[PDB]
Design an enzyme around this catalytic site. Structure first.
Site, mmCIF file in Angstrom:
data_model
loop_
_atom_site.group_PDB
_atom_site.id
_atom_site.type_symbol
_atom_site.label_atom_id
_atom_site.label_comp_id
_atom_site.label_asym_id
_atom_site.label_seq_id
_atom_site.Cartn_x
_atom_site.Cartn_y
_atom_site.Cartn_z
ATOM 1 N N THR A 260 -6.213 6.346 7.816
ATOM 2 C CA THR A 260 -7.322 6.794 6.898
ATOM 3 C C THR A 260 -6.935 5.599 5.765
ATOM 4 O OG1 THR A 260 -4.455 7.080 6.207
ATOM 5 C CG2 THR A 260 -6.662 8.383 7.305
ATOM 6 N N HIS B 111 4.972 6.834 6.948
ATOM 7 C CA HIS B 111 4.677 6.616 5.492
ATOM 8 C C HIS B 111 4.013 7.120 4.992
ATOM 9 C CE1 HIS B 111 1.029 6.069 7.886
ATOM 10 N NE2 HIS B 111 0.666 6.733 6.825
ATOM 11 N N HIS C 23 0.767 -1.389 -0.359
ATOM 12 C CA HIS C 23 -0.132 0.074 -0.145
ATOM 13 C C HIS C 23 0.624 1.606 -0.115
ATOM 14 C CE1 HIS C 23 -2.388 -3.096 2.023
ATOM 15 N NE2 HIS C 23 -3.017 -2.559 1.007
ATOM 16 N N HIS D 45 1.908 8.746 1.651
ATOM 17 C CA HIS D 45 0.675 9.091 0.719
ATOM 18 C C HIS D 45 1.400 10.064 -0.554
ATOM 19 C CE1 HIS D 45 -1.749 6.847 3.551
ATOM 20 N NE2 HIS D 45 -1.183 7.925 4.648
ATOM 21 N N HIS E 176 2.619 10.623 7.164
ATOM 22 C CA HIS E 176 2.088 10.702 8.655
ATOM 23 C C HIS E 176 3.111 10.062 9.554
ATOM 24 C CE1 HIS E 176 -1.641 10.887 6.499
ATOM 25 N NE2 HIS E 176 -1.452 11.606 7.089
ATOM 26 N N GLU F 77 -3.644 13.847 1.668
ATOM 27 C CA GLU F 77 -4.814 13.053 2.062
ATOM 28 C C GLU F 77 -5.526 14.435 3.010
ATOM 29 O OE1 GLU F 77 -4.138 9.288 4.401
ATOM 30 O OE2 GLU F 77 -5.008 8.374 2.353
HETATM 31 ZN ZN LIG Z 1 -1.086 7.783 5.894
#
Ligand SMILES: [Zn+2]
Length: 257
Positions: free
Chosen positions: A195, A91, A61, A93, A116, A103
């Site tokens: 999330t 990590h 992911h 996004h 994050h 996000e």
């Molecule tokens: Zn995250």
């Protein structure tokens, strides 16, 4: 299983995780004019001097940079928080292009990526217990914009070739997450969720106002990762972000004016 595609992405998550349509989901759009300046909010205390990174993992992911959380070595306190929250992983996004990837949004603006840093409340003893509690996690969110390189990111970028595909990990010791922070610790805060599945409503969000700058080359290396496992059909790891969710009965507070 869940993912970010047409057939398994955010709009499908509610079928396996009904809490997707809950009362305190994340991320959200941060309306800067509606956010209330709260003079009662304290400065954020980020104490990462003794952080012990151990490993980096491609989990199909994103990638996670993991820490030894077996003692109070890398903790977040103050800000909107009561007590002490220990760093367990960070990590990102990110997008397929620089115009999307974050996000949280700010007045509907999307950043190229979002970092994050995930911390769990030591009063619950372990991460798995903490995520069952409404004050179990504190996630520090940091926007990424494309411009100048972030020198402190380059060690992360340069290990990604070794974890291209899902289920690959690599030793990743001695990385200092202080090198990922912006100058200011001004923030917004609100109660929300993880999330990605399981989407548990256990997070105090702390989103920094000031983005970090990364280079186009840095972000392009994120986009060379794969969601698929070794040998499987290549699907580039891009657009691994959940869009903004309804704010419902929540107030976003600002530490600053
Ligand atoms: Zn995250």
């Amino acid at each position: 299983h869940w993912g970010y595609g047409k057939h398994n992405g955010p709009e499908h998550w509610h079928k396996d995780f009904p809490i997707a349509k809950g009362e305190r989901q994340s991320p959200v759009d941060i309306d800067t004019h509606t956010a209330k300046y709260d003079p009662s909010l304290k400065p954020l205390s980020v104490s990462y001097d003794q952080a012990t990174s151990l490993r980096i993992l491609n989990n199909g992911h994103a990638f996670n940079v993991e820490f030894d959380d077996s003692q109070d070595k890398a903790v977040l306190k103050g800000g909107p928080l009561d007590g002490t929250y220990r760093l367990i992983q960070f990590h990102f996004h990110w997008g397929s292009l620089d115009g999307q990837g974050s996000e949280h949004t700010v007045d509907k603006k999307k950043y190229a990526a979002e970092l994050h840093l995930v911390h769990w409340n030591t009063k619950y003893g372990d991460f798995g217990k903490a995520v069952q509690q409404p004050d179990g996690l504190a996630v520090l969110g940091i926007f990424l914009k494309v411009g100048s390189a972030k020198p402190g990111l380059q060690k992360v970028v340069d290990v990604l070739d070794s974890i291209k595909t899902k289920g690959k990990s690599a030793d990743f010791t001695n990385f200092d997450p202080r090198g990922l922070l912006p100058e200011s610790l001004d923030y917004w805060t609100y109660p929300g969720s993880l999330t990605h599945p399981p989407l548990l409503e256990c997070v105090t969000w702390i989103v920094l106002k000031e983005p970090i700058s990364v280079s186009s080359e840095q972000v392009l290396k994120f986009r060379k990762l794969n969601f698929n496992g070794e040998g499987e059909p290549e699907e580039l790891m891009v657009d691994n972000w959940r869009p903004a969710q309804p704010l419902k009965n929540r107030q976003i507070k600002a530490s600053f004016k």
